[PDB]
């Protein structure tokens, strides 16, 4: 579990080395939700991912496998409450597998 630092701006982009990979997330307000563009190692992984609390950002096995990890919002994404109140957490491969195991019987 690694919290990704954030700032309370509507549309932004953050790049960092997490889980032995170069991740880049661009978070922007789209209508009345937040959408995220996620790119790993330059090549883009997904566009227009609608962000929700507890629900992982990378949802297809073609992206977060093997052991790449995933990103989770504790609450529904809202840039007005970025920095405090709302966080984005990065899970490694094993920890995301554990999270999915707890998540599949809810």
């Amino acid at each position: 579990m690694k919290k990704i630092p954030l700032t309370a701006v509507p549309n932004q982009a953050i790049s960092f080395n997490a889980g032995s990979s170069y991740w880049k997330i661009r978070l922007y307000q789209n209508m009345d939700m937040m959408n995220a563009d996620i790119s790993r190692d330059g090549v883009i992984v997904c566009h227009g991912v609608r962000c929700f609390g507890g629900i992982p950002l990378l949802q297809y096995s073609r992206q977060y496998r093997p052991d790449y990890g995933n990103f989770v919002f504790d609450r529904d994404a809202d840039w007005t409450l970025f920095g405090d109140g709302i966080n984005l957490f990065y899970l490694d491969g094993a920890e995301f597998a554990e999270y999915q195991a707890l998540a599949t019987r809810k």
């Binding site: 307000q29 209508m31 009345d32 939700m33 937040m34 994404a77 809202d78 007005t80």
Partner: protein, 503 residues
Amino acid sequence: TLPAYNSDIQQALKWLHNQAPGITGLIQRKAQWYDRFSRQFWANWERDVFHLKTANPFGLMVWCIILGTPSKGFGLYPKNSSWAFGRLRQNFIYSGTQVPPPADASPGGNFYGGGNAEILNLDEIRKVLQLRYVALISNGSIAYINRMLRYIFNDDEPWDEATGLYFYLMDSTGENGPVENLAIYRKDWEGMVLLSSSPRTNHVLTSTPASDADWPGVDPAASGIPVTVETASATAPDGSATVCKLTKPAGSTAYVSAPIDGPLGSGSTVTFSFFAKAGSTRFIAIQSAADFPSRADAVFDLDSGNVISDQMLDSSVVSARMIRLENGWWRCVLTTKTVSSSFRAAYVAPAETNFSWIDSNSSAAIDVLIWGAQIELGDTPTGYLETTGAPVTMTDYVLQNAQTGTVKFTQPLPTGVEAYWTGDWKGGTAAEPARFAVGNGTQDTFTLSDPAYIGLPTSGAFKLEYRVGPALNLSPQLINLMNDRAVGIMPTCAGCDVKVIQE
């Protein structure tokens, strides 16, 4: 997220263009077009996506690709294109060489809608598609499939068995065949009144007082004389002129209390009932006693038939109810539960005002006609029993022969009284009263009547069958397509051949 979204198109149009018929017109109509082709487009597209409401056939066929259903058996496209027989359908289209405006007999006609395999109503297409999805998800549960079928076809409403809606699935279980939970009622001048197999007691000493000395009249205020009970020559519901009349004098707050063996019991539900006739007043006040001051009160409007007030000075009150009787007679039943055993008497008061209590003021003397008091244990009123200074105990019936259902009564049924039963027997449920006997006066044993619906065992291993139709009047095409095992619509388990068929 939160701080609005704008995106109005009309926003471009500054204060300068307030009297323009030009730029303003251009922006108006461009905005209208974008509205029609985005907001209306996605609104009716969401209506397309919604399976609960998919009148549009495009949505139905979208969903049938999604689920993999063969569309050959479907009846989409607009109807009214077949001639067949009748003025409500098409006719033979001939060679209209001159092109008459009426388009000869008809503008067309085709054999579209070949039956015995094909269903036409679009409402049932959504039904079969949702059935396919339920088959897709199903792990084989029978309770789940019954509940989903109820939810999809009856929209999750309970139904009567006189109609006979959907039934079970593959589970070799006979529902019944023994006989249980026999609620027997009787039809008489007291209406639908159930009977008890175990002894039941009415604790009042006298339930039809003919003299003032029969019951005392208690008055804390003692401003006026107590309410006097006098034999009134009025036809009682039993068929006699034995009713009593109770009069509350002007300025009197007294109440008549029927003597009763006490205590009634600790932590026991009690029920008070009586028969009343509308008199000078319009309503009656009832009170169930308890430890001071934990009593319960209620008032019953003899005419309008409403429990317009019921008060619980403590945990006493449970429920109140009223029942009609011909010749303008009424029965008021109050059910009360208290943890104390201070039930000394039940208080009755001819009320002046519609919320008058047991001790409210009486401007004048108001008389009411009372007959047939009964205070008893349990939580449901029962048949009237004449008590003359005796807490009378009695058993209504004994089930001598369970399997054939014949029942023995303590006394023969009076000439003209009827019987009703509710429960389950012969592998069939009857949630409504069913008649099986009419009184003759010389016989007291009577056989039960058949409830309903299918024997129910359906003996077999690894296979069963549906039951449907005499309720939903479903099209025969639905049943015929349903029976087609190759379509893969029904939820099923490998190794169980379940036919659908049935009405």
